[PDB]
Amino acid sequence: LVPVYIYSPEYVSMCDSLAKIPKRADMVHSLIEAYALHKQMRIVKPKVASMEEMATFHTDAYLQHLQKVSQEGDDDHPDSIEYGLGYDCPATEGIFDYAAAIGGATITAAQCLIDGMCKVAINWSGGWHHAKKDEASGFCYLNDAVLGILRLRRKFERILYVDLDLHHGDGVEDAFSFTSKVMTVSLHKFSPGFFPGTGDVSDVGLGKGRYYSVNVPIQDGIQDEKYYQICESVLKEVYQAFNPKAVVLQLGADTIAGDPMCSFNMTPVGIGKCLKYILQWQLATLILGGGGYNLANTARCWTYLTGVILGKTLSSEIPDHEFFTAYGPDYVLEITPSCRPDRNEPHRIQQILNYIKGNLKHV
Ligand SMILES: COc1ccc2[nH]c(C)c(CC(=O)N[C@H](CCCCCC(=O)NO)C(=O)NCCc3c(-c4ccccc4)[nH]c4ccccc34)c2c1
Ligand SMILES: [K+]
Ligand SMILES: [K+]
Numbered sequence: 001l002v003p004v005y006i007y008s009p010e011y012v013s014m015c016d017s018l019a020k021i022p023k024r025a026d027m028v029h030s031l032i033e034a035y036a037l038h039k040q041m042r043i044v045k046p047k048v049a050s051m052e053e054m055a056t057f058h059t060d061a062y063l064q065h066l067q068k069v070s071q072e073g074d075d076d077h078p079d080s081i082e083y084g085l086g087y088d089c090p091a092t093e094g095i096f097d098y099a100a101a102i103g104g105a106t107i108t109a110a111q112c113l114i115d116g117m118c119k120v121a122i123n124w125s126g127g128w129h130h131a132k133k134d135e136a137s138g139f140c141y142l143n144d145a146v147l148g149i150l151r152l153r154r155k156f157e158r159i160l161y162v163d164l165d166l167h168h169g170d171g172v173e174d175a176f177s178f179t180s181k182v183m184t185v186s187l188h189k190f191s192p193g194f195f196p197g198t199g200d201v202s203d204v205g206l207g208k209g210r211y212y213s214v215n216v217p218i219q220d221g222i223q224d225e226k227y228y229q230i231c232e233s234v235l236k237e238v239y240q241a242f243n244p245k246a247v248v249l250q251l252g253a254d255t256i257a258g259d260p261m262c263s264f265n266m267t268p269v270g271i272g273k274c275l276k277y278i279l280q281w282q283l284a285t286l287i288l289g290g291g292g293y294n295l296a297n298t299a300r301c302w303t304y305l306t307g308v309i310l311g312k313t314l315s316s317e318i319p320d321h322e323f324f325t326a327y328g329p330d331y332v333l334e335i336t337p338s339c340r341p342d343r344n345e346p347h348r349i350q351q352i353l354n355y356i357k358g359n360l361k362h363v
């Protein structure tokens, strides 16, 4: 069938404004373009999200406030702080239109999937997983992952959200905590002091959604093989227990060695195997990005992962293109782990995995 790639030049410029990750969207797309991977995909222009589409999760008070403060720069408005705007999520000029573009893009991806137009749709500029119904958080003005899941919910009865960002997918988890129609699984750094402070293995959801949230708390220094071992093992148990008919996959590259968060020690090859394992299920799959603050490494990563979606092996040499020099001084696609210790004790990992098996026996 071949994958949908959500993209337009206007979309990319829009996504380039975010101060936490400037030009990252351009770098990501330009590298994929340079390896000519767009030629093997169906390019789809994203619809901007309508108010009612956004309101499917976000309160009208939040959206209106976000739109109002969008007019010109800000950070000063009296009501901004209660809506999560301010110093993590500053309310700059245009943010609302930026938010509506990314939400729209993820919704367009989901709609493609419902319509049978692909088995895999990609929005590398999506994945803003902390935003709550009435609150910005963790650089997320809008939870486009939730919007995507609520779009998929039109066709699919069981949706699996898998979140391989460094941070807990707390916003998406909370959104679906009370329901059993969407199971969330997050692998993330969990250490008191580390944002957002949620997602211990004992967090399983609430009410009718009890045991339909899965959290895998992991410590600094994890490298490819042991990460995959954990991820494959949890996902095996999840697929057998939950039998999902669609998957939203968040792949924030802030786990990759060289990220200034300096926490995990992964390469794109190990994430790539987690991804291959998900894609072997051959379900409708909505792929999203997320964190990633070494810009060249994030483009390296997501370009690689696009390669795995297409079943391609990529030349190790980085092709000449507009951003070639950001890949200096070695100009290769491969990333090398740091010489840092892995702080994950096998006994704790095995404890976590057992707790999770135990929880999933209820599903
Ligand atoms: C208990 O944990 C919690 C819970 C709720 C919280 N609310 C807030 C505002 C915070 C403070 C906080 O930690 N704020 C942010 C959250 C990061 C959002 C990442 C989005 C993502 O990728 N999601 O998937 C924070 O970490 N801010 C920056 C910390 C930081 C780093 C940094 C962060 C982690 C490791 C090394 C450096 N470098 C900086 C340079 C300049 C200014 C700030 C920094 C907070 C913490
Ligand atoms: K995560
Ligand atoms: K749930």
Ligand SMILES: [Zn+2]
Binding pocket: 165, 166, 167, 252, 254, 290, 291, 292
């Ligand atoms: Zn992150």
